[PDB]
Amino acid sequence: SEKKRRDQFNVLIKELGSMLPGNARKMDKSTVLQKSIDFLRKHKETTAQSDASEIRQDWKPTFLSNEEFTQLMLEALDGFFLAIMTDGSIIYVSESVTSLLEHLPSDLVDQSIFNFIPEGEHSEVYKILSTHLLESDSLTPEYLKSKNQLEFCCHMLRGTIDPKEPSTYEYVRFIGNFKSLTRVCFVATVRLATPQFIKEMCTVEEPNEEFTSRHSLEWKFLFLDHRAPPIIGYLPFEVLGTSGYDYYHVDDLENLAKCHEHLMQYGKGKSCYYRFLTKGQQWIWLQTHYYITYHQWNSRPEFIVCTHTVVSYAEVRAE
Amino acid sequence: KNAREAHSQIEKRRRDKMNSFIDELASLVPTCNAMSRKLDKLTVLRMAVQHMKTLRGAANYKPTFLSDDELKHLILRAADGFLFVVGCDRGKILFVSESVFKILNYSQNDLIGQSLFDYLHPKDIAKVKEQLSSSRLCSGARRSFFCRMKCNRPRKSFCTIHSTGYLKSNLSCLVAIGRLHSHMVPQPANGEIRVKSMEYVSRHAIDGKFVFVDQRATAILAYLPQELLGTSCYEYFHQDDIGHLAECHRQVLQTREKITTNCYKFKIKDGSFITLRSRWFSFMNPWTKEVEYIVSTNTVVL
């Protein structure tokens, strides 16, 4: 039993040491413990003496995971994460880029950031990226060094659903630092200068989500099933009696109306992709299957049954 | 034995040194240090290894090459506004970031435990209440709204805060970030670069009364929605533009085509005028064959 605790102890020590910075890989249990203590200590010291006092501030509640706090903060801030080689090659970008600039992550990854910045601004940005080169001591994390911290602004091309519209830009601000990889890259939070209060939800987190409504012959809500609130936010009583058209994106109204005419004519139908305004003020992309139910005896239209599918931005844009 | 003695002294010294290392290590680890109960050496070691994972360990929502701490600093450096958690039941402020003092000039101590509704403009208590009514953050749990919150030192005893957050749960609450946005438009779009213009949508009854205005409208015109709804668009148009605009109104009722107005001035909340250009259409409900409303996309003009 002593050999098992000794072996588990060695495993823990070796794992601990593998995480230690520096060229040399020390194996000595004592050395590893000394250096680990030194690291945690230099980290408390540095995080207590940093320039940005915002890093010491009480921000995230204990019950809130890092993941959720990051999603929430990025949304509130109209920001996404972006990592680009000093080369200018994008190596990473947050999913939220899609709702902010209407690019798919696959549009950006393995591409040059200069393809998305106006040519007039290229040289300056080149400078920012190429100029800064820093050597970091093993003891002090690169991202804790003020010299490695940096902010700058520039325009970034917005993606689009239609190629017709002229190239259009968003003014943004990079707040990031330089980091070394196992080359050198610059990792940042990129924030749009123009606040975006209403955005599209571009990915279906759930593998698939679906809900049901019924609409009157005036297109007013008559029914909303129990699956709808976790998707669109509203409880039934909040929308019942209100026009479906109140919730559609302006740019979709026309198309939706055409679909409805087709429906009135044929009794069954499938909508085009369209945007629905959730209680939380996000557009979700839907596609809806419709059919008219007729009275059992007089055969007159009674109501429309709608089955709503939530769809990803990638599907909408693909066609 | 005498011989083995020196060696067993090397053993005892190495052991005591080791244990002292583990104790120091433990005191440096938040998780370990907190607990009142004494911890086993192997467990202090496991916890220390995990903490160390959050610092240097070891893509879903972050690149694989960034540690959790790195991501935290990356986000906080860009942070703005303040985070708050309010109980949905009674509206009690269960938490608020210290950054709140920068925004409203109230400290954490001032606010934590108080009722959020004591710090809202009375005309907003109801709307916010509606936001707290309940229904890996899902779209249905999202809430987003403007309201006026009390500022400690004052006509400026309220500031317009936009909150973005999600309903969360044993207790149900709203976790949100409140931000105070600057209204005016600096960095007017340069000639060389086509920049996206600010817009907001409004819908109007046949006679011009606001029946809907989107969140962006509060950002642009500073009015809260309940301030515009039920009022006539003509109350806000600059008198030099009233004629032209009424003419576009009358026209748009006569066609299903989009009509674009000339630029015109619109009176925002502080009584000054900004310059807008609107694209209007009368949307006809194809089921009723009746005009549902005039739908207007209003663009801020430079």
Side-chain angles (χ1 to χ4, degrees):
Chain A
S1 177
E2 296 177 345
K3 183 189 67 60
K4 191 186 68 174
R5 288 177 62 75
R6 187 173 186 88
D7 295 332
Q8 292 173 350
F9 190 96
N10 294 334
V11 172
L12 279 171
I13 299 289
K14 196 169 191 175
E15 185 176 16
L16 200 47
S18 68
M19 272 183 292
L20 291 178
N23 180 317
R25 174 65 65 84
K26 291 304 178 62
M27 298 285 85
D28 191 325
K29 307 180 189 185
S30 180
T31 303
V32 169
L33 291 177
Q34 179 61 71
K35 189 167 182 178
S36 296
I37 292 172
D38 291 334
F39 173 87
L40 295 177
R41 183 164 293 173
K42 276 178 176 295
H43 191 291
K44 278 186 176 180
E45 165 192 344
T46 298
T47 300
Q49 302 172 2
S50 61
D51 292 30
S53 181
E54 299 73 28
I55 301 184
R56 298 186 302 269
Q57 295 175 10
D58 202 17
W59 266 102
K60 182 188 76 52
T62 173
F63 85 97
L64 202 67
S65 74
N66 292 324
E67 183 184 359
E68 296 170 329
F69 171 81
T70 294
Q71 176 192 347
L72 176 54
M73 183 75 41
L74 285 185
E75 288 194 12
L77 293 175
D78 294 318
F80 57 96
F81 292 131
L82 181 68
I84 64 181
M85 291 310 180
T86 305
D87 179 28
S89 302
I90 305 164
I91 66 193
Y92 177 89
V93 66
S94 290
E95 205 78 346
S96 65
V97 75
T98 310
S99 55
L100 295 164
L101 301 175
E102 299 194 58
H103 295 295
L104 293 166
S106 69
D107 288 318
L108 303 174
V109 174
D110 288 324
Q111 295 296 340
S112 171
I113 183 69
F114 300 101
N115 292 327
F116 299 92
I117 300 177
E119 299 170 4
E121 299 186 338
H122 286 186
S123 66
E124 183 52 26
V125 170
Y126 259 107
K127 168 174 183 176
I128 278 59
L129 301 177
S130 307
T131 307
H132 183 284
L133 297 173
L134 180 141
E135 296 298 325
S136 64
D137 57 342
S138 59
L139 297 166
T140 300
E142 306 167 316
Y143 67 102
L144 295 184
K145 307 181 72 65
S146 305
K147 293 184 181 176
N148 292 327
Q149 312 283 38
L150 189 50
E151 311 183 1
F152 69 87
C153 300
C154 71
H155 294 75
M156 271 186 71
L157 177 74
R158 296 185 53 82
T160 186
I161 303 178
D162 58 7
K164 185 174 184 181
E165 182 182 4
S167 68
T168 297
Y169 292 78
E170 287 292 357
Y171 199 54
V172 306
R173 165 172 285 268
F174 296 64
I175 310 177
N177 51 83
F178 295 88
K179 188 188 185 299
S180 298
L181 277 60
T182 179
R183 278 298 205 181
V184 177
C185 78
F186 182 76
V187 49
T189 303
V190 180
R191 287 177 65 197
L192 276 55
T194 303
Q196 319 270 299
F197 302 89
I198 308 179
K199 295 172 294 195
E200 299 172 7
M201 183 195 79
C202 292
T203 53
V204 186
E205 57 178 11
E206 306 287 358
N208 304 87
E209 41 190 10
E210 169 188 293
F211 66 97
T212 293
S213 67
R214 302 191 249 113
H215 284 257
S216 74
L217 294 174
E218 303 184 304
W219 209 244
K220 299 187 173 167
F221 278 105
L222 292 180
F223 175 79
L224 187 74
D225 77 352
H226 67 282
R227 300 182 300 171
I231 304 179
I232 65 172
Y234 301 109
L235 294 175
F237 83 92
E238 297 183 87
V239 306
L240 289 171
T242 69
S243 177
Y245 298 115
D246 293 358
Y247 302 85
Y248 302 152
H249 188 291
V250 174
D251 290 349
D252 300 329
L253 280 175
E254 182 183 277
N255 293 319
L256 281 168
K258 288 185 181 61
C259 295
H260 297 165
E261 289 174 333
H262 179 260
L263 179 61
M264 302 177 68
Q265 178 182 349
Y266 290 95
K268 295 179 254 59
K270 182 187 67 169
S271 82
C272 52
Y273 294 128
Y274 66 98
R275 283 158 290 196
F276 185 101
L277 189 68
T278 69
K279 177 176 188 165
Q281 303 304 109
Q282 269 187 311
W283 298 113
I284 55 178
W285 286 96
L286 302 179
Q287 182 175 58
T288 300
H289 288 81
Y290 299 120
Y291 64 91
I292 297 179
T293 292
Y294 294 87
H295 182 260
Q296 181 179 0
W297 306 108
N298 64 48
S299 304
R300 290 182 290 269
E302 186 170 342
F303 57 76
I304 305 89
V305 183
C306 310
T307 304
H308 309 286
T309 303
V310 180
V311 304
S312 70
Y313 184 86
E315 170 178 345
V316 165
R317 218 187 66 179
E319 187 69 330
Chain B
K1 289 301 176 178
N2 166 270
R4 175 188 56 83
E5 179 57 22
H7 283 100
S8 70
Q9 286 305 119
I10 297 175
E11 295 177 339
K12 188 216 299 178
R13 264 131 48 191
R14 188 183 310 157
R15 151 180 165 80
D16 297 331
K17 175 187 186 179
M18 192 70 49
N19 296 337
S20 63
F21 272 152
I22 304 299
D23 290 338
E24 188 175 2
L25 189 63
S27 68
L28 285 173
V29 178
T31 55
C32 287
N33 207 16
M35 300 181 61
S36 176
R37 299 292 182 267
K38 177 60 178 184
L39 297 173
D40 180 27
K41 303 300 180 178
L42 279 184
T43 74
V44 177
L45 218 50
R46 295 185 181 274
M47 294 171 180
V49 161
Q50 290 199 5
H51 181 60
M52 194 65 189
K53 287 174 184 175
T54 76
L55 295 181
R56 305 201 87 264
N60 39 28
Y61 75 99
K62 69 167 193 57
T64 67
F65 54 83
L66 290 185
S67 79
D68 294 335
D69 199 52
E70 287 182 282
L71 194 67
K72 176 175 170 288
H73 288 36
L74 194 65
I75 189 67
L76 296 192
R77 280 192 57 216
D80 176 71
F82 62 95
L83 184 152
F84 63 99
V85 183
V86 46
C88 291
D89 305 337
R90 309 280 162 89
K92 205 177 69 169
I93 306 167
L94 311 175
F95 176 84
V96 69
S97 54
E98 59 190 64
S99 65
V100 74
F101 179 82
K102 180 187 181 179
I103 306 297
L104 309 176
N105 211 250
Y106 283 101
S107 73
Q108 286 180 275
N109 276 8
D110 298 323
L111 297 189
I112 291 182
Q114 304 303 326
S115 161
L116 174 64
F117 310 117
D118 291 342
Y119 300 89
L120 298 174
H121 190 301
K123 290 297 184 180
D124 291 342
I125 297 177
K127 292 295 185 177
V128 165
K129 274 183 152 53
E130 300 180 22
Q131 298 307 312
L132 300 175
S133 294
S134 308
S135 62
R136 57 159 302 278
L137 308 164
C138 78
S139 57
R142 188 183 210 266
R143 297 298 187 269
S144 169
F145 58 89
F146 279 102
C147 68
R148 290 158 286 185
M149 300 196 186
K150 294 182 183 180
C151 306
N152 198 14
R153 173 70 103 171
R155 296 168 294 94
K156 294 182 300 302
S157 55
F158 292 102
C159 62
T160 300
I161 293 302
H162 181 259
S163 307
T164 301
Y166 291 82
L167 292 188
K168 189 84 175 171
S169 53
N170 200 335
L171 173 53
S172 183
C173 58
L174 173 71
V175 187
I177 309 287
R179 295 184 56 200
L180 170 57
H181 288 97
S182 172
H183 64 286
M184 284 293 293
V185 174
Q187 177 83 359
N190 300 2
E192 228 52 72
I193 304 176
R194 172 86 175 184
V195 175
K196 185 174 173 184
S197 25
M198 302 193 74
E199 293 186 346
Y200 75 87
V201 172
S202 59
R203 306 190 298 256
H204 301 267
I206 301 315
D207 75 345
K209 281 181 194 167
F210 281 100
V211 293
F212 168 86
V213 69
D214 79 20
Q215 276 202 149
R216 299 178 292 173
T218 294
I220 299 170
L221 315 168
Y223 299 99
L224 273 69
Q226 61 251 60
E227 302 186 291
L228 291 170
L229 299 178
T231 72
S232 171
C233 57
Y234 295 97
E235 288 180 31
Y236 310 88
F237 297 160
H238 183 282
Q239 70 167 247
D240 293 352
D241 298 312
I242 276 186
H244 164 64
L245 292 168
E247 187 169 29
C248 293
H249 185 169
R250 291 189 291 269
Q251 288 176 9
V252 82
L253 293 175
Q254 302 301 81
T255 177
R256 292 298 79 84
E257 304 301 316
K258 286 59 183 173
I259 285 183
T260 296
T261 73
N262 297 334
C263 299
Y264 64 88
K265 290 184 198 65
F266 188 109
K267 181 173 180 184
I268 70 190
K269 189 169 176 46
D270 70 25
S272 62
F273 288 93
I274 74 181
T275 303
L276 301 174
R277 184 170 191 93
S278 298
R279 188 170 199 176
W280 286 352
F281 59 101
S282 45
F283 176 74
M284 197 186 64
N285 184 326
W287 298 91
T288 68
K289 289 175 185 62
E290 190 188 331
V291 171
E292 190 82 21
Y293 24 52
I294 297 168
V295 178
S296 183
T297 298
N298 316 291
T299 305
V300 174
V301 170
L302 306 69

